[PDB]
Amino acid sequence: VGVLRVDNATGAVDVV
Amino acid sequence: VGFLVLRVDNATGAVDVVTTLREHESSYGEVVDTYWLNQYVLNREAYDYNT
After folding, report:
1. Among B12, B18, B33, B50, which residue's CB has the most CB atoms within a 10 Å radius?
2. CA-to-CA distance for B21 and A13, rounded, in angstroms?
3. What three-state secondary structure class fits B5?
4. CA separation for the pair A3, B12 (Å, rounded)
5. What is the largest CA-CA distance in chain B?
6. What is the C-alpha separation between B43 and B38, in angstroms, rounded?
7. Contacts of B9 in chain A (CB under 8 A)
8. How many CA atoms lie within 13 A of B34 on its CB side?
9. Sequence-ordered strand ranges (E) for chain B
10. Which of residues 1-51 of B touch A (CB under 8 A)?
11. B18 contacts in A (CB within 8 Å)?
12. Could you give the CA distance from residue B26 to residue B32 in angstroms, rounded to a whole number?
């Protein structure tokens, strides 16, 4: 039997 | 049974921890405390003749 988004204006990084 | 990224500010070199799917609040005053700390610093450090 044996994504993330980055704000270019605030540099804020957030997991999807 | 046995079966956070770090953000580096290019201008300040300041490293911020980007939480991984984490918005947890630990306890009463854990986030309430942050409010008071914010309002304290903002009002203390800020200045406007009018307010």
Report:
1. B18
2. 11
3. strand
4. 26
5. 64
6. 8
7. 11
8. 6
9. 5-8, 15-18
10. 5, 7, 9, 16, 18-21
11. 4, 12-15
12. 11
CA distance to A11, B31, B42, B46, per residue, from B25 (Å): 23, 6, 22, 28
Alpha-carbon distance of B49 to B24, in angstroms, equals 39
B12: exposed, middle or buried (Cβ count in 10 Å: 0-12, 13-18, 19+)? exposed
Long-range contacts of B11-20 (CB under 8 A, 24+ apart): B16/A11, B16/A13, B18/A4, B18/A12, B18/A13, B18/A14, B18/A15, B19/A15, B20/A15
Query: Resolution of this PDB entry, in A?
Result: 4.3
